[PDB]
Design a protein around this nucleic acid. Structure first.
Ligand SMILES: [Mn+2]
Ligand SMILES: [Mn+2]
Lengths: 131, 131
DNA sequence: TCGGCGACTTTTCGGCGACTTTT
DNA sequence: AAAAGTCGCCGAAAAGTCGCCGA
């Protein structure tokens, strides 16, 4: 009895993805919203500069499918270590604001807040359609 | 069978806790109330002026959980030796005023009275809701 | 007596190949 | 045949109680 759902978020690392990863993700025909790059997140480790550059993708599947469905589809796309920690997204509004660290979880924990503009929306991601 | 309860008090020693302990207690997401620093308690031994610096944390679990649980929950958070003497609290109010030694028993036994201003409330600890 | 800790138990949840349904 | 999708099944950690205490 795995959970089937429409909204997912996962991480992409610049190392494990090919050059054209952006055009690579457009192919699937599914609305995505790709956070700006996270080169400046404070690590929960002493003396430690920042966490590694990563992305937060917000993935809007067209029908209820399972976490594993999405992991594998992007594992085919970009390399089997391309992504990590695919999760089911419960509140879309938050996990969109979370790409900027400008949700309330993030500013409450005072994390470094990125630029609205660098978010990349693939196949006409409509924030309003899902809220 | 051990006792289940929602209200707890335990002690925090500044030596055994990391710099960012205060913020790390906020992570647990639980209403806490942290005594002002207890650096001038009268020691019960002759020629011993003060007791070792401590804090009294006042801890409100979201569901009746066991003394031991809270102990694990905090060892893992601040270090195996971070805390001490976790007990269940039967009257919050009295034990709230005890953080300043302004309860009945504290003023009764002539304990050193600290300043409210230094009390720290974590996650919107609202003493009034508890009476 | 009653706070304590290691041993244990129990959820919790994200992986990943293997099997299965869909195209 | 191939794509996509889910199904067992594993592991680890974050949680929790239990056993015995021990001063
Ligand atoms: Mn991040
Ligand atoms: Mn004290």
């Amino acid at each position: 009895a795995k959970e089937k759902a429409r909204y997912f978020t996962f991480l992409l690392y610049p190392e494990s993805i090919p050059s054209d990863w952006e055009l690579k993700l457009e192919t699937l025909g599914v609305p995505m919203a790709i956070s700006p790059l996270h080169d400046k997140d404070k690590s929960s480790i002493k003396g430690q500069k920042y966490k590694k550059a990563h992305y937060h993708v917000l993935y809007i599947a067209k029908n209820p499918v399972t976490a594993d469905s999405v992991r594998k589809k992007i594992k085919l796309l970009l390399g089997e270590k391309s992504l990590a920690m695919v999760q089911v997204v419960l509140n879309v509004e938050n996990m969109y604001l979370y790409l900027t660290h400008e949700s309330k979880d993030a500013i409450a924990k005072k994390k470094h807040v990125y630029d609205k503009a660098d978010i990349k929306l693939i196949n006409n991601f409509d924030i309003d359609r899902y809220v």
